[PDB]
Structure formats: C-alpha cells, structure tokens
Amino acid sequence: ILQHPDGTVLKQLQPPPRGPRELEFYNMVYAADCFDGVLLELRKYLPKYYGIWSPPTAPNDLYLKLEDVTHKFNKPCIMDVKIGQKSYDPFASSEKIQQQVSKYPLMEEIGFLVLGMRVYHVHSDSYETENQHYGRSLTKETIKDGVSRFFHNGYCLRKDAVAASIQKIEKILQWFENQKQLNFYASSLLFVYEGSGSGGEVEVRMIDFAHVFPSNTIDEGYVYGLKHLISVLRSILDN
Ligand SMILES: Nc1ncnc2c1ncn2[C@@H]1O[C@H](COP(=O)(O)OP(=O)(O)O)[C@@H](O)[C@H]1O
Ligand SMILES: O=P(O)(O)O[C@@H]1[C@H](O)[C@H](O)[C@@H](OP(=O)(O)O)[C@H](OP(=O)(O)O)[C@H]1O
Numbered sequence: 001i002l003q004h005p006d007g008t009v010l011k012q013l014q015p016p017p018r019g020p021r022e023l024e025f026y027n028m029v030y031a032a033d034c035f036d037g038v039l040l041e042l043r044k045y046l047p048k049y050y051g052i053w054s055p056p057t058a059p060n061d062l063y064l065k066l067e068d069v070t071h072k073f074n075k076p077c078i079m080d081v082k083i084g085q086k087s088y089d090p091f092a093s094s095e096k097i098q099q100q101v102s103k104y105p106l107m108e109e110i111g112f113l114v115l116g117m118r119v120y121h122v123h124s125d126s127y128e129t130e131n132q133h134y135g136r137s138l139t140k141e142t143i144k145d146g147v148s149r150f151f152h153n154g155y156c157l158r159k160d161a162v163a164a165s166i167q168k169i170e171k172i173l174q175w176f177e178n179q180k181q182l183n184f185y186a187s188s189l190l191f192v193y194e195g196s197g198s199g200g201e202v203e204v205r206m207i208d209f210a211h212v213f214p215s216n217t218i219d220e221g222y223v224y225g226l227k228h229l230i231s232v233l234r235s236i237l238d239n
C-alpha cells in the first residue's frame, strides 16, 4: 500500500487469482453503466475507485487507485478488522483451509479478527500500534478489552467514536441484509476516528476484496461477524 499526497492510495494487485479478482470486483461495482441498485448502494461503503493504474514507464506493474479513507483526518486512529466466520473462500484447498483456520481458530466463534490498529495517545502526541499477533491472541474472554483498546487515547475511552462506529456498521449490516448476490471472505472493515472540541468525524469502510464471489444466499458469516462486532461495541458503551 503506497500513500499518495493527492488523497489516494495505490494498492498493488496481489498475485493471481487474488489481484485480478479484486480488480474485477471494483470494475463491477464502479461500472459507469451500472444501474443495479444493490451495487450503487454498496459504493457508499467502499473507498472511491479511480481505476486501474500503472507507472507511465511500467505497464506491467498493476495497482488499484483508491480513496485514502484517512485523508480528511488530522491524527487518524485506524483499525482493520477482518469480518466473517470463514477466512477461506469456496475454492480453497484443504491446505489453505487448514492454514487459514490455524491463523485464527476462533474465527467461527467470534466472526471477526482484529488485524491491526494504530491509536493516537493525546498525552504524548504519539501513536501506539498493534500488529497481527495482537488480534490473533484475543479470545472470548479478552475480545471486549481487546477492541476497547482502539478507542482509548491514554486518558479516556472515546465512547463517541464507539457509538458512531456502531451506527455506521449498522448501515453496512442493512446493505448485507438486502442483497443475496455477493459473499465476502477475508474482507475487512477499516475504522478511522479523529484522535486530536468537535472531532466527531468517523469512517467505517469495507476494504480488501480478493475473495468476493457471486452467490445466491445472504452472506451469513459476514452478517454474524457484524452482529457480534456491534454487540461487543455496544457493551463497551457501558464501561
Ligand atoms: N482505501 C484505503 N484507505 C486508507 N487505508 C487503506 C485503504 N486500503 C487499505 N488501507 C490500509 O492498508 C492495509 C492493507 O490493505 P488491504 O487492502 O487490507 O491489503 P491486503 O490484501 O494486503 O491485506 C489496511 O489494513 C489499511 O490500514
Ligand atoms: O498475515 P500473515 O500472518 O502473513 O498471514 C496471511 C493472512 O492470513 C492473509 O490474510 C492471507 O491472505 P488471504 O487473506 O488472501 O488468504 C495470507 O495467505 P497467503 O499466504 O496465501 O497469501 C496469510 O499468509
């Protein structure tokens, strides 16, 4: 992921089949001649898409040019949460299924996995980061405090950002409850709030679409993960 001063990011296409699939997902959603109401609504929850991009001198090197969801923030606090009960897709091999379940064998039970966070601490004007091993170490007993950490700025819990997050996730859940044409595996929600007195800006966007597939069913694992995440955030409001 390359961050560009124009308010965009360039995401390098992953090797096939993942990179090509993510490209085609964005092309499908953002097709200029799209009149599918489901897809037009989905656009609101994705980074804006500016098409495929390559360097002028390197047509081989393929990127997606996307809105930088963090651009409007002064001190963005960022968390990436993988959503669903399964982080492997319908065409995964036995080995891949085993790999993915072994990365986090609680995915079926919890329905989400924190991939990382970067949190602004007001007292020290500095960021604290957690890597992939943080979320993979969370259990049912520790998931609430694990998530809470994202919203704690060193002196208080940002319940404003928690409540805003619930409200934005709820609109995404509504979209999911009103479509049966796409299932999303190994995709994430990106949470951003303002760390730096009306810093009430919050973003929750869907990202990472290397494993989205056509379907004829509600995405039940995704819905389960969103509901559980909402449940956890709601309990944090009682702290
Ligand atoms: N559109 C975006 N705006 C801001 N940050 C982004 C955006 N897309 C990705 N990122 C950041 O880059 C990280 C990795 O991007 P992602 O699409 O998940 O790639 P990967 O397929 O390598 O997991 C995310 O966790 C997020 O912090
Ligand atoms: O973050 P880590 O610990 O390196 O582990 C990776 C992580 O689970 C990725 O989400 C996954 O890609 P997919 O979500 O696309 O499966 C990747 O699979 P890969 O090794 O097959 O790329 C894993 O190696």
Ligand SMILES: [Mg+2]
Pocket: 188, 208
């Ligand atoms: Mg990702």
Ligand SMILES: [Mg+2]
Pocket: 186, 208, 209, 210
């Ligand atoms: Mg990915």
